[PDB]
Amino acid sequence: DRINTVRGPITISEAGFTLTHEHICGSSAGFLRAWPEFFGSRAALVEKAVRGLRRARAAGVRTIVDVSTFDIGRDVSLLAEVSRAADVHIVAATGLWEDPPLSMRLRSVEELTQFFLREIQYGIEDTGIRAGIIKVATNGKATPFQELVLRAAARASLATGVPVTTHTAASQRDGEQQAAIFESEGLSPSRVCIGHSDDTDDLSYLTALAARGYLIGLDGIPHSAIGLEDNASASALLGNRSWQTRALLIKALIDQGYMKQILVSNDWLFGFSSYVTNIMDVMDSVNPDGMAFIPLRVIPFLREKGVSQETLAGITVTNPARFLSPTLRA
Amino acid sequence: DRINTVRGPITISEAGFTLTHEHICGSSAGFLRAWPEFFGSRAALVEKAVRGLRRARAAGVRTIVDVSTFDIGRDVSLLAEVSRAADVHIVAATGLWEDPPLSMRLRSVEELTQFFLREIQYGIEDTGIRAGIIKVATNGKATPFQELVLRAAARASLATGVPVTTHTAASQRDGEQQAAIFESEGLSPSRVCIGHSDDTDDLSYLTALAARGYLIGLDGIPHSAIGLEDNASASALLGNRSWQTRALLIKALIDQGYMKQILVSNDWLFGFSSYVTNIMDVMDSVNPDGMAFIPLRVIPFLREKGVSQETLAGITVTNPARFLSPTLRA
Ligand SMILES: CCC1(C)CCCCC1
Ligand SMILES: CCC1(C)CCCCC1
Ligand SMILES: CC(C)OP(C)(=O)O
Ligand SMILES: CC(C)OP(C)(=O)O
Ligand SMILES: [Zn+2]
Ligand SMILES: [Zn+2]
Ligand SMILES: [Zn+2]
Ligand SMILES: [Zn+2]
């Protein structure tokens, strides 16, 4: 009956309209503390994030799930500061993404489970802030270490009821192997979001995951380099499918009977050091609405395509609450 | 005329007997803050390091150079705490070792130079503690990113006079390429230590570096898995050459006229998370003297082999002072 946020436990009804895959800052462990000038200053990043979350809140957002891990440079005191100033709930993450350091890559499945449980059950660092989701990643076939991470995430979820959310190379159908590993540990698909699933048009892949009870993360709707002329780095990151193409996958899965299993988000950030310099400025040019893109552009677009207000409320409010609510089977 | 330590500037004469390549903790950025229980506790690691540095000090050590970078999980407040409690000067490092995260790997030569200068000229994180050495690494042919690091280290040294110290795959003769890159940026060899040079017996390699004016880091003298039975992970890390074999390289370079260019150390640690679990316990079984191994075992061994007290004082006191003393040409 409670979800952990960076400001403490909230009731399910307090979560309201929830963006399930977002970032305050996409960075690396220790980087914001060691090199804050990369972002102008820590104060400049805070001010940018507060302004952005205030615009999201004015557009109807009440909660974001910051799926930044240890290795995305998650700074839960930064999330707490921004959450307080913007009056937007932030759920923090544990887990590991695609850039673990050696001190994490050399660990066993049991050691990793201990670390994920620490962040869920005790707190992140010395902050007492507890994660309300476990984030994991593959980019194609899982590395041996990534198989241990997915198993440890499953064990941590089985002990606590906290859900798992994933990064995929969606065009490589990674969710199939992620599902296989999770299920081998006994994890209910109802506790798992297969993310970056809007990066593919393959309905045979998306419905194979949805049919076995996975939540489908259509989480990068504004990610598009269409229109950016001669920017190879932005094209490699964002792809050349339109936001409309991505958004129509929401409608596709509704039309196949999966409205209760869809989670929608922007996968936006206010700082981004783990890619090319100045990527944040390019991304802000593409999508000046930032995290407000879902409510301001995607919801009206789907309404115009014949999706009901009730169905979209179920996707943006009911599904996130059912996902985030701790349980072994949702 | 001053060397920066974790407790502030010290005079050259205050450095005294100096171990030029050591670690309080060999970890990863953010790891000790996020998972202190890996080490038992932060307090247990502090107590172990203080006990070890007190034993070194009783054996005659006055200063260690902690060559832990950002990506070795350098915690300068941990170094300051241990330095104060043990009454042993600690020089901190900037630079990057072999485990940089994406937020560092995507940076340009100019950006990296800015970051290294920040840690030398302004301070590490928000601590005001300034690095007194730049640490860099290759493991065989430099990656493209490692070429940028070595160039940025050279630029940072050329601006400040702070020396550069390296990690090599010594058996792959990496110091030849490291020298080539440093010299292409205009860096004096007198400002550079080519480290882990005791990992090779190739005198053709070691004298090629020493002849052009490089300092030679014979920095892993107690690293040996001889005697450890059936421990593949310890054998891969420590090698199967004896500490005596490593120590006799000191005598070899003295006998070739390079006594002023030799730097000796243990490359010891009090915590080690970036390798297999329990490696610290295996290493402590091999070398119970820890950082005191140089003064307690190596110095007497070299005296027994006919090296003078005066020559060994020049290696352990004069050479480190000449190396660490900021200058463009030593
Ligand atoms: C029948 C699918 C539906 C019209 C349900 C109401 C929300 C919009 C989708
Ligand atoms: C001649 C080399 C030397 C005997 C000099 C004094 C110290 C030991 C080495
Ligand atoms: C910056 C990283 C976390 O972004 P992503 C694009 O994997 O969601
Ligand atoms: C733990 C790391 C820094 O050790 P090394 C063995 O490269 O000196
Ligand atoms: Zn991702
Ligand atoms: Zn993301
Ligand atoms: Zn090394
Ligand atoms: Zn070292």
Numbering used by the authors:
A (entry chain A), B (entry chain A): 35 to 364
What does the paper say about this structure?
Accordingly, it has been characterized from a number of bacterial sources, including Brevundimonas diminuta (Bd; formerly Pseudomonas diminuta), Flavobacterium spp. and Agrobacterium radiobacter. The present study focuses on Bd_PTE, a dimeric metallohydrolase that has a (β/α)8 TIM-barrel fold with two Zn2+ ions embedded in the active site. The buried α-Zn2+ ion is ligated to the protein via direct interactions with His55, His57 and Asp301, and the exposed β-Zn2+ ion interacts with His201 and His230.
The short distance between the P—O O atom of the acid products and the buried α-Zn2+ in the C23_2, C23_4 and C23_5 structures, together with the similar short distances of the P—O O atoms observed for O,O-diethylphosphoric acid and O-ethyl-4-methylbenzylphosphonic acid, suggests the involvement of both Zn2+ ions in catalysis. The OP products observed in the C23 crystal structures are in their ground state.
